[model samples]
Target: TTALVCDNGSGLVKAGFAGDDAPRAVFPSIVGRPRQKDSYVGDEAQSKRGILTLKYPIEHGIITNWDDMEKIWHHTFYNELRVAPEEHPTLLTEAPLNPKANREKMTQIMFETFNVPAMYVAIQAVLSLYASGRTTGIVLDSGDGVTHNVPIYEGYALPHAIMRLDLAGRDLTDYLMKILTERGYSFVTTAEREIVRDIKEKLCYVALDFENEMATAASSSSLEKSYELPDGQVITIGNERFRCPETLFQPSFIGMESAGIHETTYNSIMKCDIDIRKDLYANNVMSGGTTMYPGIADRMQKEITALAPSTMKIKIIAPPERKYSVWIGGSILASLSTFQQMWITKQEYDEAGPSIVHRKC
Candidate 1:
């Protein structure tokens, strides 16, 4: 089955057998034209992108074009994997408020394109819960598009249980791109934003104290220290020339309005079971692209761990592939006999029909 998960940051498509094997393939939710009408995807689309107008195939968190999406899905699935779709079950993801219309369309696309008989869709946060393997934990899902903190309740009104902040990888990339441009790197265009992003990933960190870091960034000596550019330009890291990644911790420096993850976490917890707050230090889980930054593990814990009682649990969980945690969980569930019950199989579809099956979403 196809695990169709779309994030504002990356529209990820995964296809393969269940848990034992990794996703057979993964592709970004972006397509580009080396020139008009000549579209490419995943890595191939990004290859000659300096001259291409790359477009994200998602709007908010849903597939923007069902037909065009089917084209890419089929290419990534059957064509690439040489697999018969009738055999697998699709466990996909959508945003919390992903529209009913969008969900209906997603199910239709899966069934029609690759002959997928069974489909199960879920919100990414819930799928991520399965990834953590913990019954009660808070998930801080930081990705390219936005950051969400969701509390897992085995029972009770699941509520939205989700809090979102408009901060993510894209913001970081934009921040870095702007900073580099202002630093005289006129080539820091859309094509090169990702280069800055990659460097930020490699060289950036969230300084616990923004003011302190800002002062450090201002001295003139740092800019003379060069970091190699993607295009082979020897650019200086410079004084006050830190990568844009640090803006997450120092948004005030950049003048962007955001609470950053630290405050976002504290506030999100307050909205959750307040009693749990006392134990958050021992029990909170962190999984997402942001968790993988070199010092994030230490930084987040150091900043928030003490806020919770000493006797309480404080555990920070950052999976290796923080980006794919949800899809991996979906993959795991697809292989399970029980979760498969939630899926709409093709045989059932043949009997009940598409309109009926599509409405189930």
Candidate 2:
């Protein structure tokens, strides 16, 4: 039987059958309900924006609203993938350092509620590494709500070496909004927020040398680009493009006390056994939406190189499909015939209960 792979992210949910190059459906991880009884998920929720109250089922990469999450899973299986849950095995991805209790609850839901034939839960960082064809590497995953620097050794994550940042795509968007707002561009509604987010994605990029770029931006108009809002108002985006993403390298710019992405990544590598530091540095993998900004990999490699031992080599592998790396990795893993035995079957669930997932997966 074919397996279903679902990467449940804080910002979006990617779902499709195993072995596919891309997800069949990628939708916002939100559930919306009107003042009445009817509810909607994903695209439908966005369509009913003004009429509904949106609720995020996941926060900072952890499932917080199981009631709404079940709805999302139901929608993905029935309305999106159009698959029968009982016939196909399932693979789900979770953030690093996810709670033990949450794993068991997810397993229980898979077997008891959805009634899948078999199920497996995998760490997002590991799946991302696998997607890049590396069993050992450092995965820098930054989605909407959080960024994690995770070190893997021979297919297993070194949990102790993991570092997390409470800044990512959403934070960058807000930073952009702040810059725009200062320029008299106000966004007060959710729809307007979406517009700002679109602007950020389309215009924002990292600067190879932030200070030099800032100097150039002040003296020349070459870096400025005009963007016409939906309402036909024209706004010129100049240094804000680079300034927004710059926060990743300099969190102090955003008033955050934590170390920046490069620092955290280097810190994570340093925490690992000294024997593996060289390997980790050479295979630093980049995954997730926030990591897609142009020049991020180069900037990361440059910054990390400056901080590391001069003789060490650093490589940042930003795969072309990094935004979907976790899902793609799950797809690859579940499709392997040898992995078929790895699933925790319904019988096994019945025998050991949901706790079986903690032991098997």
Candidate 3:
């Protein structure tokens, strides 16, 4: 009765069967290939999202089957979901309120080519709730895909109670790219964008006070930030040189026409009734890749604290192991006997077929 799980995210696709055995395989979701023709995938798919392609599948919060995306999906979703093809009663978690057509394509592939006996589709944000074991708490899934927050009731999730923000790892990278270009980096190439992201990860920190940290970093007291190069070149970076990692507060600098993460989260919290929001202000969870940006969690906490009513506390559940929260939880769920019951059976899938228009939660 073991089931396979496809904990696919904007950044990576993780596959494993129930049980914490060896071989919990995870890979970057990107699919790339040589310049000649249709690209192949593997490590190359990443080729650096914001660093190269201004738009990545995960960026706008949906996957489009264009270019090599079809190939990537077929291989990653089907081949990667199971260590072996025949494995079934598989469970793959997807995003909440996923677009219908994408789900349609995914369902077709899973049921048809992979021949999975069954499948369970859990929202990544919902999966985080199980990982935290927090029934009434907010679950934030922080990763390259943008921050997703969901309110948990009992063991299930409420999709209507959710919020999404524009700034993520890609956005962070974009921000960095702009600054580097303006300050003489002029990395008008993908390699430069990825290299900058590498530097940002190495040196970026969430400032408890954004403006103050910016000022200090701009001043001489902030010290120098150095990066090691593949060719053995050492470079020092400073805030004035790269302003966008701290630019989440001012996302408009990048021309993204959406509310910043802070405002989106706050508005979403307000949508919840009075009491839950009271705790939401105190129980803010920063999830997704952008959350890891320099001093982002603390900045978010401070911003919410100031914006929220007085006496309300702001809590940031940024586990040191934050990056793998969804994938790890999914790996755990894949190993569960109870979770096995959640998947759609092969017989059921065949009987219903991909054309079935409606599904029950």
Candidate 4:
């Protein structure tokens, strides 16, 4: 049977059949309802944002509202993929340090509610490494709500070394909003914020040298860029482009008392066993949309290189399809003939109960 792969991120949901190169349906991980009873999910919800009260089911890479999450899964299976849940096995991606309670509940929902034939819940970081063609590596995944530095040693996540940074794509978007607001650009509504997010995505890039880039930006308009709003209003972006992403390297810019990305990566690797440190440094894989910024790989390599021993080799693997790497990983995993034995069947779920997720997955 063809399995279904769903990468349920805090910001977006990517769902498709296993063996596919990419997710067939990728949309916002949000539900919205008008003043009426019926609610909308994904793109439909995004389209009606002006009149709908939007609610997010997942926050900081964890599902908070199973009701809304079910709605999302319902939408994905029935509406998007048009597949019966009982026919195709399901593979879902989860965040690192996800509570055991959450895993059990997720299993319960899939088995009891959806009546799926089989299922498997995989850690996002490990799946990300698989997408990068490695079984052992340090995965830095920065999505909409959270940034995770997870060390995967031969397909297992090192719980002790894993680090979560609250700052991510959403924070950068908010910071961009703040910078734009100070420049006399007003974006007060959710719809406006979407536009601002688009601006951030289009214009933002990590700086190779923060101080040097700032000086260059201040001295000349060469780095200045312009974007036109939906209503035909043009806004010029200068230093804000790099300044927005700089927050990831300098959380002090956002007044957050947290280590920067490079520091976090180095610190995470240090917490691991000495034997694997060199291997971890040599295979730093990047995933998620926030990491799609131009110059991110080069900047990350440069900074991590500075922090690591001179003899150590630092390589940042930034695949072209990293934004969908987790989904791709699941696609690869679930499609393998060897992986068929891994999925917990309905009979197995019935016997062992939902707690089996902790054991099998």
Candidate 5:
């Protein structure tokens, strides 16, 4: 038997059968409304991005447009996952800051719309921990719009220890747009902005030695690479390659008066009991789209080691393909025979209404 697992993320939705190591389909969370036609979702919308008016169902890791959301979920269930929702128990992942109303709405949708026999929603950070094959760790997750340092202890996220920042992939994209625009490169719309994001993903790196890399970038060929734009203009990027990603380590560079990612991670671990801090530090886990930067783990490990207690050994476990780690965890979780008891059945929803999700699941 197959179970359904969905990770509704700000940038993308990852959905597939449970027990699978990776999602069968991954697509942007936006739906395209083309004039004089029905809405498009997933690959169809993505292909017609320039011609259609694209709207996101989720933003800042929360669902905002229910109409488009229903459409997107329908696409995921029927077209992408290619499974009937009513045929399997569905498991969904939610962000740590998800509102109660969102939970109710999600429960309603899964049962009412999809007619699934049972459903459950798990916290995103918890699922990320599940993906790393650990129940406790500091999860440093940076997706498109938000960065969160969530500490999970025994399958539960410690709310008090969680730290959030306004810096992430979109921030880096906008920052690069500013730098590119100042240097006479310009884009007219989202499509062009997406190209800039691709450039950042392809070229960006966390600098282990920022100053030295800057000097080397200026005078050395090793640090420079040429990129060809859509219009066939080839631009040579040097220091900006590493500088863009460097802002994540030093938020002061972006004018944010917040602690750096490593500082936040260390502080979160400190909030736990002293005895467990060692294990948390030793199993530091990373999951997010942006965590794919080439040297992120090494850079964060060095920074964290500097402030961590010498007796505590620091290890950063970043999955090879981290973008879908949360979804992968959800898949693993939903596949467990023990997880069957955790599901909220259709009869329970009928007896207690949507709020039953608050306690039962």
Candidate 6:
């Protein structure tokens, strides 16, 4: 039987068959609801992006619009993945502490709308641990919507120790846009926002030493790159590169309430069991899009090592492609014969209703 896995993230949706190494269809989570077409999901939404009103189905990793959510999955299964839901056992990843109503709606969609054979909703952090090839570790996930640290012990998440911040990749992108706007560059449309995001990903780098990086960026011999805006005007990017990402380390710089990512990680460790603290720090696995920034691992390691006990091991594992770690974990998981027992069958959903999801999978 076919098996499908989807990492329904705030920024992007990654979906494909279970055995695949990575998702075959990765696109923005937004759906373009045009007057002409029924609705466009994934990359199709992006293709006709500028004119139509684009709306995100998943908000901060939770489904807010069932109508668009249904359209997105339908597009994922039929158009993108090219797999029929009725024959496949589908698996999805969700944030920890997802609302009960959201899970029920998900169940209703999978079994009732698409007639799925079986389904499972796994926590994203645990999948990140599995993606690291470990049953226990600390996961630092800095995605587009939120930055959080999750500590997993023996394949279970310790929600009490989780650390979350509102600051993330999107914040950095917005900050970059703000700096550019102050310098006479302005973006007016969602399509232009994509350009700002591309500029952030292309030009930004985490500062190893804040003062030193800032000084270098401001010097006469500063490294400058030219980015052509949507209107075809070239803007030079220099200090803005390091200045924008600086907010992640010092959220106060952006007037945010959260501490730096390193401090957040340390606080999370302190919340865990003392005995497992060393192990968690040793297996410091970083996942998510923002963690992909250059020198982020090195800088985080430097700061975290300083905060940690001298005798404790402080090793940080930053994956080559960090953004899809959770999806990769689900892919590894659903492909296993041992994982077959974990899916919530249609019979179970019929008997217990959506609440069966809490106990069955």
Cα lDDT tens digits, model 3, 87-134, are 656666677667767666666677776676666666776666556545
Which candidate leads in lDDT?
A: 4
Alpha-carbon runs more than 4 Å astray in model 4: none
In the range 273-292, model 1's lDDT, one tens digit per residue, is: 67666544444666656556
TM-score against native, each model: 0.81, 0.98, 0.84, 0.98, 0.95, 0.95
Per-residue lDDT, model 4, residue 209, is 94
User: Candidate 2 — what's its lDDT?
Assistant: 0.93
The 10 consecutive residues of candidate 4 with the worst lDDT sum are 183-192
Whichever of 2 and 3 has more lDDT, that candidate is 2
Give the Cα-based TM-score of candidate 4 against the true structure. Answer: 0.98
- Candidate lDDT values, in order: 0.63, 0.93, 0.63, 0.94, 0.86, 0.86
lDDT tens digits by residue: candidate 6, 10-105: 899889888888889998888897646777887777888766788887776677889988888898899888888999999988887678888888
Q: Per-residue lDDT of 4-120 in model 4, one digit per residue for the tens?
A: 999999999999999899999999999998855599999988887878988999999999999999999999999899999999999999999999999999999999989999999
Q: Per-residue lDDT for 1-361 in model 2, tens only? A: 8899999999999999998899999999999998554899998888877789999999889999999999999999999999999999999999999999999999999999999999999999899999999799999999999999999999999999999899989988888888888877786666778988998889989999999999999999999999999879898999999999999999988899999999999999999999999999999999999999999999998999999999999999999899999999999999988888999999999999998988998
Pick out the ten consecutive residues of candidate 6 with the lowest summed lDDT.
183-192
> Candidate 5 — worst ten consecutive residues by lDDT sum?
180-189
Clashes of each: 13, 0, 24, 0, 0, 0
How would you encode candidate 5's per-residue C-alpha lDDT over 229-312 as one tens digit per residue?
Answer: 988989877777888888888888779988989999988998888777887898888998978888899999899989987877
The ten-residue window of minimal lDDT in model 1 covers: 2-11
* Shift in Å, residue 80, candidate 5: 1.5
Give the C-alpha lDDT of model 6.
Answer: 0.86
